[PDB]
Amino acid sequence: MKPHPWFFGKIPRAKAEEMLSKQRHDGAFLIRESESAPGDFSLSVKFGNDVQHFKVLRDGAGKYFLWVVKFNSLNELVDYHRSTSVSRNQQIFLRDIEQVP
């Protein structure tokens, strides 16, 4: 298929904020590899004039989750949260970034 447009590797938290702050649509997001917690992933998401960040948590077996529902891949967790909100305070659905192209 195609590589996913949402995996940014080891981009600093502040550079994820810089990039997402130029996005127009709420829910534009990326997965990055945390610098403060090496070996952990973080999800950064545009919402309004902000950028929210969430830890990608692991269970004892290595499944990934944000809150309660967990998955066998980052790819399945991202796809799940295209239609189930990532936030408990707003309805925020992941959508791909509109890329410089």
Can you read off the two tokens belonging to residue 7? 């995996």
Nearer to Na ion, 56 or 78 (CB): 56
State the minimum distance, in angstroms, from the CB of residue 40 to Na ion: 4
Q: Which of residues 31-50 bind Na ion (CB under 5 A)?
A: 40-41
- Residue placing its CB nearer to Na ion in the complex, 41 or 47: 41
Note whether 98 binds Na ion by CB under 5 A.
Answer: no
Up-side HSE of residue 28: CA atoms within 13 Å toward CB? 19
56 binds Na ion (CB under 5 A): yes
Cβ of 100: how many Cβ atoms within 10 Å?
6
DSSP 19: H
Q: How far is the CB of 97 from Na ion (least distance, A)?
A: 20
Taking the CA of residue 94 as centre, how many other CA atoms within 13 Å lie in the half-sphere pointing to its CB? 21
Q: Which residues bind Na ion (CB under 5 A)?
A: 40-41, 56
